[PDB]
Amino acid sequence: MLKCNKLVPIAYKTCPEGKNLCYKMFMMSDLTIPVKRGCIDVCPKNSLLVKYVCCNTDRCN
């Protein structure tokens, strides 16, 4: 049950059972800085509105 990075510097949230990967979300507005981060098992495909980047590591995002 991996950890995803939320509050700086390191502060993290615990991924739910069955989930592994950590993702961050971008907006067509703010590409530079991601707007949401969390856990998921399967990395969500990119949308027109928001972009998804996942990692198989702890506190990447």
CATH assignment of the domain containing 31: 2.10.60.10
Task: Tell me if 17 sits within 8 A of 1, measured CB to CB.
Answer: yes
Please report where in the chains the tokens 């907006």 appear, as a residue.
Answer: 27
How many independent structural domains does the chain possess? 1
The CA distance from 3 to 13, in Å, is 6
Cα 3 from chain centroid?
Answer: 10
31, with CB counted inside 10 A (0-12, 13-18, 19+), is: exposed
Range of the domain at 47: 1-61
Cα distance between residue 50 and residue 59, in whole Å: 20
What value, to the nearest 5°, has the Cα angle with vertex 1 and ends 32 and 36?
A: 20
Six token digits for residue 58: 């702890």
